[PDB]
Design a protein around this nucleic acid. Sequence first.
DNA 1: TTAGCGCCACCTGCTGGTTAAATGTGGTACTGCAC
DNA 2: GTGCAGTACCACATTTAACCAGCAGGTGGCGCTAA
Length: 260
Amino acid sequence: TRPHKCPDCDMAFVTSGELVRHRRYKHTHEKPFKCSMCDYASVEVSKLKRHIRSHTGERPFQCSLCSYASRDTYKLKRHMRTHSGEKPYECYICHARFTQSGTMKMHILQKHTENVAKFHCPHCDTVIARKSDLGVHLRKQHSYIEQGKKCRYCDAVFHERYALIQHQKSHKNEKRFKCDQCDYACRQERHMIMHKRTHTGEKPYACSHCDKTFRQKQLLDMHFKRYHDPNFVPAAFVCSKCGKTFTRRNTMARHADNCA
DNA sequence: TTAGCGCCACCTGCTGGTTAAATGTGGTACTGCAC
DNA sequence: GTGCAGTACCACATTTAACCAGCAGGTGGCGCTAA
Ligand code: NA
Ligand code: NA
Ligand SMILES: [Zn+2]
Ligand SMILES: [Zn+2]
Ligand SMILES: [Zn+2]
Ligand SMILES: [Zn+2]
Ligand SMILES: [Zn+2]
Ligand SMILES: [Zn+2]
Ligand SMILES: [Zn+2]
Ligand SMILES: [Zn+2]
Ligand SMILES: [Zn+2]
């Protein structure tokens, strides 16, 4: 039961080899064998093996059910959870199960904690929680475009999407449509079409029970509902101080406020 | 002693489905004015 | 009062990007063995 103990820390190990290796990890901090490619070194030979494999790209073990070959056995074991499911880790609050420990840690941090430090965009004012989400934001909004992208409503050309969106947000209080015969302007195409119809005098809309024609659909609907609906009675608003009748609402107030 | 192996975690990073905020559409009242 | 013309609400349908769980690559720590 742990014959050996580390003098400089609290760890106790059964064998001399295990305690020595623990001393290598935390106390000796030596680098006898490093990689032939870079300056990285390790304590165990298998760590240098997998580092060399990452340098070269060798995948020893292949998945039984899929076409994935892993450089390490633990990678294959974790991959097997894709086919088997079997989410080991469980949240202690919402009791949700997750396949990887990091997934559970991120879930608990971002779903059951209020004050969590967040990342700030180096180029814009947006604030994001996850660094991966920040990378997506940078790669989408802040990416550079060689060919550029013209503004939707002007001849301005931008290379960063964030700049393009910020420019296009300045055109949301503008009447692009302008009549060629007068100074009238509007924001929706239907209004411009109606104005040009009034300019030309065209009345495309026609009543189906009379000879009358209209320049707008709403006008024809109101005429039909008035002069072709026997069971219709107009709304009459009565002054509360004198009693005389008024049809439109605003006129009734115009009389009631000045009535005696 | 010592390399090998197995397990486990930690750290980092990418990626599609989900969803909620933002935004564009169009039906339908709603007034100003000329008659 | 009313019809025409232009405007104003606003419920609704897209649009878009953060949210989030699902994944994989590189490294650090430990417990035994057989070699
Ligand atoms: Na409109
Ligand atoms: Na996924
Ligand atoms: Zn120690
Ligand atoms: Zn190396
Ligand atoms: Zn598989
Ligand atoms: Zn949870
Ligand atoms: Zn940004
Ligand atoms: Zn513009
Ligand atoms: Zn005009
Ligand atoms: Zn009619
Ligand atoms: Zn009155």
